[PDB]
Amino acid sequence: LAAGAVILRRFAFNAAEQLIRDINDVASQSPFRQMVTPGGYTMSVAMTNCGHLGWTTHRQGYLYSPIDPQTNKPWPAMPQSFHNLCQRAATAAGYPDFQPDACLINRYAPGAKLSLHQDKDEPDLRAPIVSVSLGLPAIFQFGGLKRNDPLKRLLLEHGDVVVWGGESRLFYHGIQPLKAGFHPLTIDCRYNLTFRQAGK
Ligand SMILES: O=C(O)CCC(=O)C(=O)O
Ligand SMILES: [Mn+2]
């Protein structure tokens, strides 16, 4: 896909059913919620987290916290299925020592989108981003270090895993408005699992 980035198409296909079962378990403790940006806007994507740290929004500035600001309780621990799939994907991508301490779970309803951004809330740039697609297909935008750099448009389907790091760790990326559709395992949405090393 780019220097230090690759797309493992259908890599998580066999694990998908189990991953989704665990998403449901995580959501039981920390429900999906549409976060409000530091700017005061409700995101179309619904999110939740598991692992030691969870990505969240604050009155002013994104940040990681071990506490779910909605439930006021710790985020659920990282499911075994998540941990194992993530490490296998990272190894295949060329990052064998990846040890994530956070997993952001995104749920896209039809029309939902995640505008172009950089994952720049993690201090240790040596750790890659492992992104798992589940359910409905979406168009993933992958660019460069500048918001105006040319964008690649790649369809991401159920089971696809994208890993980026090294030279492309801070590349801009996003998801275009989700097209309506149906998928036997997620029904009416697309889920995405984003593993990161947010601390240390
Ligand atoms: O849904 C995706 O494929 C991308 C999600 C993403 O960029 C994020 O969680 O920071
Ligand atoms: Mn991102």
Curated annotation (Swiss-Prot):
The reply to whether Protein biosynthesis figures as a keyword in the UniProt entry is: no
Answer whether the UniProt record assigns the keyword Transcription to this protein.
no
Query: Looking at the UniProt record for this protein, which Gene Ontology cellular component terms does it annotate, in alphabetical order?
Result: cytoplasm; cytosol
Enzyme class, first EC level, given as a word: oxidoreductase
Enzyme Commission code: 1.14.11.33
PANTHER family according to UniProt: ALKYLATED DNA REPAIR PROTEIN ALKB-RELATED (PTHR16557), NUCLEIC ACID DIOXYGENASE ALKBH1 (PTHR16557:SF2)
Which amino acid positions bind Fe cation, per UniProt?
Answer: 117, 119, 173
InterPro entries cross-referenced by the UniProt entry: Alkb, AlkB-like, AlkB-like_sf, Oxoglu/Fe-dep_dioxygenase_dom
Consequence recorded when altering residue 55 to A: Abolishes activity towards single-stranded DNA containing 1-methyladenine
Pfam families in the record, alphabetically?
2OG-FeII_Oxy_2
Under the heading NCBIfam families, the entry gives: alkb, PRK15401.1
**CC cofactor note:** Binds 1 Fe(2+) ion per subunit.
Name the protein family: Belongs to the alkB family.
Extract one GO molecular function annotation from the record.
dioxygenase activity
Query: Known catalysed reaction(s)?
Result: a methylated nucleobase within DNA + 2-oxoglutarate + O2 = a nucleobase within DNA + formaldehyde + succinate + CO2
* Residues engaged in binding substrate: 55, 62-64, 121, 147
Give the record's keywords alphabetically.
Dioxygenase, DNA damage, DNA repair, Iron, Metal-binding, Oxidoreductase
Protein name per Swiss-Prot or TrEMBL: Alpha-ketoglutarate-dependent dioxygenase AlkB
| All copies of domain Fe2OG dioxygenase, residue ranges | 99-199
Role of this protein: Dioxygenase that repairs alkylated DNA and RNA containing 3-methylcytosine or 1-methyladenine by oxidative demethylation. Has highest activity towards 3-methylcytosine. Has lower activity towards alkylated DNA containing ethenoadenine, and no detectable activity towards 1-methylguanine or 3-methylthymine. Accepts double-stranded and single-stranded substrates. Requires molecular oxygen, alpha-ketoglutarate and iron. Provides extensive resistance to alkylating agents such as MMS and DMS (SN2 agents), but not to MMNG and MNU (SN1 agents).
* Cofactor needs: Fe(2+)
List residues binding 2-oxoglutarate: 106-108, 190-196
> Which biological processes are named by the entry's GO terms?
DNA alkylation repair; DNA repair; oxidative demethylation; oxidative RNA demethylation; response to methyl methanesulfonate; RNA repair
